[PDB]
């Protein structure tokens, strides 16, 4: 019963569990985690990111 409950709970919750620190967002310094990177992170070295006003 303990093993079955362990397996079932883990299989129930592992779908939800995700790594926050999986490098996914590309960056000039290689793929990085989402929290480190924002829209201002240069995708490639020397990229121009204008401070565009949102009309």
């Amino acid at each position: 019963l303990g093993a079955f409950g362990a397996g079932t709970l883990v299989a129930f919750i592992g779908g939800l569990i995700k790594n926050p620190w999986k490098p996914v967002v590309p960056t000039a310094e290689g793929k990085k985690a989402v929290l480190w990177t924002s829209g201002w992170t240069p995708r490639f070295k020397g990229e121009t990111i204008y401070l565009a006003r949102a009309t």
Binding site: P26, R43, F44, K45, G46, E47, T48
Partner: protein
């Protein structure tokens, strides 16, 4: 507690230099090209201007 990194009284700074962006190596596989033409020479393309002065 205060955050480890704060405050800088010295080193007033400098005016940022004029930004000179670089062509995208990642987004563009190669170099973006403008006018298209046969250009049976070293290469001139489909864009050629000139200003005739006095």
């Amino acid at each position: 507690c205060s955050p480890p990194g704060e405050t800088a009284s010295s080193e007033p700074g400098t005016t940022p230099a004029i930004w000179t962006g670089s062509p995208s190596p990642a987004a563009p596989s190669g170099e973006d090209h403008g006018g298209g033409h046969g250009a049976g020479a070293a290469g001139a393309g489909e864009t050629l201007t000139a200003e005739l002065k006095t």
